[PDB]
Design a protein around this ligand. Structure first.
Ligand SMILES: NC(=O)C1=CN([C@@H]2O[C@H](COP(=O)(O)OP(=O)(O)OC[C@H]3O[C@@H](n4cnc5c(N)ncnc54)[C@H](OP(=O)(O)O)[C@@H]3O)[C@@H](O)[C@H]2O)C=CC1
Ligand SMILES: [Cl-]
Length: 294
C-alpha cells in the first residue's frame, strides 16, 4: 500500500496543496474535510488521481464528528503513517462569539479542541502502524515562544477552561470575547499540544511530534478578507509563500529524512526545540476534560 496520511482541512489553502504535494510523492491522502461537495470539486480541479486519496467527513467543531471520522477512517483498513492537523478557522472583527456543536467558542473549539481529541484518538492508529517512521504534524505559529492580528495570545490561568468552557464563556482566560485573540489563543494551544505530545509519547512510541510554520501564505482565504479590508483603509502598502510552496513544505516535514527529529518547530527551515512547559501541561489536562477523554 501507498503510505497513508490524514490531512485535516484539505479543501483549501495549505491543506489542499499539502495533499497535492504528498500525492505527488506517492502517498495516499485522507482528505478529512467538512464539505464533501467542495472537497471533491477542488480535488478534481487540481486533477487529483482518485486512486491516491479518500474524502472522509470531518467537522472539527463537533466532537462526535471527530469520533465518527476516526471510525470511518478505520473501516478503510489502511495503516496510519502520518497525521497533519492543518484545519483552522478565523472570524475577523466578529463582535459576538460563534458556538460549536458542543457550545464551545468556535475558534478554539475547531482549531484546538477538535484536533486535541483527534490526536488522542489517532495515537492508537499511529501506534498500530508497523512503519519505523511515523509523524504527527501540527500547523502552528511563527515562533515557538501584525498578520493581521496585533494582539498576543494569553491563556491566563485557563479560567475559562476551568469553569468548563461552555457558552456564555468565550475565551480560555474567561475574559471578554475578541475574535482575533481567540484565533491566536487557539494557535498557541496547537503549539502547546505538540510540546505535550512529544513529552508524553515520543519515548514510549517513537512517533515524531512536530509543529510547522510554512510561511506567510497570504493568498489563502484564512486572512484574505481581513488583509483586503486593512489595505482598503491603509492603501499605503504593497500586496510571503505561494500556496503550492507551503504545501510542499508540509510534504517535506511529513515525508522527508531531514525532518525526523521530534519535539521541534520547523519554521521558514529554521529549527526550534521545545513556563510554556507548565502552561502546556495544564492546557493538556483541562482539554482532556473538555473533549471527554476522562
Ligand atoms: N495562511 C497563513 O498565512 C498561515 C496559516 N497557518 C496555518 O495553516 C493552516 C491552514 O491555513 P490556511 O490554508 O491559510 O487556511 P484556509 O482557510 O485556506 O483553509 C482552512 C481549511 O480548514 C478547514 N476547516 C475549517 N473549519 C473546519 C472544521 N470545522 N472541520 C474540518 N475542517 C475545517 C477548511 O474547510 P472549508 O474548505 O470547508 O472552509 C479549509 O479546508 C491553519 O492551521 C493556519 O493556522 C499558519 C501560518 C500562516
Ligand atoms: Cl494503495
Amino acid at each position: 500500500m501507498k503510505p497513508t496520511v490524514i490531512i485535516t482541512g484539505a479543501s483549501s489553502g495549505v491543506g489542499l496543496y499539502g495533499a497535492k504535494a504528498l500525492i505527488d510523492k506517492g502517498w495516499h491522502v485522507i482528505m478529512a474535510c467538512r464539505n464533501l461537495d467542495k472537497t471533491q470539486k477542488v480535488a478534481d480541479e487540481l486533477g487529483f488521481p482518485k486512486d491516491s486519496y479518500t474524502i472522509i467527513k470531518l467537522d472539527l467543531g463537533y466532537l462526535d464528528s471527530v469520533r465518527r471520522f476516526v471510525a470511518q477512517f478505520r473501516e478503510l483498513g489502511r495503516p496510519l503513517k502520518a497525521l497533519v492537523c492543518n484545519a483552522a478557522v478565523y472570524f475577523p472583527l466578529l463582535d459576538e462569539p460563534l458556538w460549536s456543536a458542543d457550545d464551545y467558542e468556535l475558534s478554539v473549539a475547531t482549531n484546538h479542541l477538535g484536533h486535541f481529541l483527534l490526536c488522542n484518538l489517532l495515537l492508537e492508529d499511529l501506534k498500530a502502524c508497523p512503519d519505523a517512521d511515523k509523524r504527527l504534524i501540527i500547523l502552528g505559529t511563527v515562533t515557538a515562544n501584525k498578520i493581521p492580528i496585533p494582539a498576543p495570545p494569553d491563556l491566563g490561568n485557563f479560567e475559562g477552561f476551568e469553569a468548563g468552557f461552555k457558552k456564555p464563556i468565550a475565551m480560555i482566560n474567561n475574559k471578554k470575547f475578541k475574535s482575533g485573540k481567540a484565533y491566536k489563543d487557539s494557535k498557541l494551544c496547537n503549539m502547546l499540544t505538540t510540546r505535550e505530545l512529544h513529552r508524553r509519547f515520543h519515548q514510549e512510541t517513537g512517533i515524531v511530534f512536530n509543529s510547522l510554520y510554512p510561511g506567510c501564505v497570504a493568498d489563502t482565504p484564512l486572512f484574505r478578507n481581513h488583509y483586503s479590508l486593512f489595505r482598503t483603509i491603509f492603501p499605503w502598502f504593497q500586496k510571503y509563500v505561494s500556496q503550492e510552496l507551503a504545501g510542499e513544505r508540509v510534504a517535506m516535514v511529513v515525508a522527508d529524512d531531514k525532518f525526523k527529529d521530534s519535539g521541534v518547530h520547523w519554521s521558514w527551515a529554521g529549527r526550534e526545540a521545545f513556563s510554556d512547559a507548565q502552561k502546556a501541561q495544564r492546557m493538556w489536562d483541562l482539554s482532556e476534560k473538555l473533549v471527554g477523554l476522562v
